[PDB]
Amino acid sequence: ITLPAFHMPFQSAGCHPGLAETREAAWEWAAAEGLDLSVPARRKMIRTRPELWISLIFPQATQAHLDLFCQWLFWAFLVDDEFDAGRDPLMCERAIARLVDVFDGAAPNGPMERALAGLRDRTCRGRSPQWNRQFRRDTAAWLWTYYAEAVERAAGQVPSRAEFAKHRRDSVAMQPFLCLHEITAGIDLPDSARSLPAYIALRNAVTDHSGLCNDICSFEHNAVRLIQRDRGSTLQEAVDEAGIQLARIAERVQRAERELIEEIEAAGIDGPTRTALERCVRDYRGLVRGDFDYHAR
Numbered sequence: 001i002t003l004p005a006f007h008m009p010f011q012s013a014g015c016h017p018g019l020a021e022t023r024e025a026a027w028e029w030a031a032a033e034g035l036d037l038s039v040p041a042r043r044k045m046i047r048t049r050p051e052l053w054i055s056l057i058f059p060q061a062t063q064a065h066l067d068l069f070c071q072w073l074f075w076a077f078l079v080d081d082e083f084d085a086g087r088d089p090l091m092c093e094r095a096i097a098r099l100v101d102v103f104d105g106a107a108p109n110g111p112m113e114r115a116l117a118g119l120r121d122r123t124c125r126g127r128s129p130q131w132n133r134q135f136r137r138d139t140a141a142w143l144w145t146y147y148a149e150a151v152e153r154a155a156g157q158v159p160s161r162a163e164f165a166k167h168r169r170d171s172v173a174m175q176p177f178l179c180l181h182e183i184t185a186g187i188d189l190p191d192s193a194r195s196l197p198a199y200i201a202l203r204n205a206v207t208d209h210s211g212l213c214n215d216i217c218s219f220e221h222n223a224v225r226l227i228q229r230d231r232g233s234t235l236q237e238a239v240d241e242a243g244i245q246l247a248r249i250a251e252r253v254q255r256a257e258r259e260l261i262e263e264i265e266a267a268g269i270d271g272p273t274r275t276a277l278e279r280c281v282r283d284y285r286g287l288v289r290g291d292f293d294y295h296a297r
C-alpha cells in the first residue's frame, strides 16, 4: 500500500524548539501525578510521540503553555488507551460520567482524576465563561464519543460515511486543542464570532482534515474502511480515494478563510474580535499542516 500524493498547499509554521523539554516535563508530570503506566502503554506513548504533535501544532507557544498542552495530550492519550470495560457500555458510562464530574468540580480520586483536576485548574481558571463553555463542550463531546461507539458497537450498528464524519469531529479531539489555541494566541472569541458561518466552516474543516489524515496514516471504525465498504474497492483504491477527499477538505480551509475575511469586512468587525478572527485565519493553516506533518512524516 502506497500513500497518495497529498494536496498540501499550507506552508509549515515550524516545530517548537522545546520538543525535547516538553516531553521530559510530560513524563515528569505523569510521575508526579502518580500516573502508573504499564510497559506496553509506555512503549505506546513513546511511539505516539505526543511531544511531536503538540510542537507542530503550537510552534510559537511559550514553554509553559506547550508543557501544559502536552500534558493534556498525554492525558488524552491515556484516556483513549483505556477505552480500546472499554467496549461494555455500562462501564464506559460510569467512567466517562466520573471524569466529567471531576471536570465540573467533583473532588478527584484516582491518579487520572487528580491529573485532570490539575490540568483543569491550570487551564480553565482565568479564562472567560465564553471560552470555558466552548472548552467544556468540545472536551465533554470527545469523552462521550467513547460511550457512543460502545453503545453503537454493542447494538450491532455501523456508522454511515456521513455519520462518521460528524462523529469524527468530536472523536478526533482536535477541537479541544482549538480552544487551547486561544490561550497561546492571546485571543478570546465572543459567541458572535463563534456564530459566523465562515468561522464555523473554518473550524470544522481544520477538524475534518485532522480526523481524515489520522485515519489515512493509520491503515475501530476508519474512514478509509468505510470508503472501502461504501464503494467495494481494494485497500489502495480506498486510500487514494480517501486522499482525494482530504484534498477537498484542504480546499474547504481556503474557501472558509476567504469567506471569513469577507464576513469580517461586511459585518464591520473591528477591535479585538477582528484581531482574534484574523489570528485564526493566519494560524489554522499551520495547524492543518502541523497535524499533517505529524501523521504523514
Ligand SMILES: [Ca+2]
Pocket: 009, 251, 254
Ligand atoms: Ca485551492
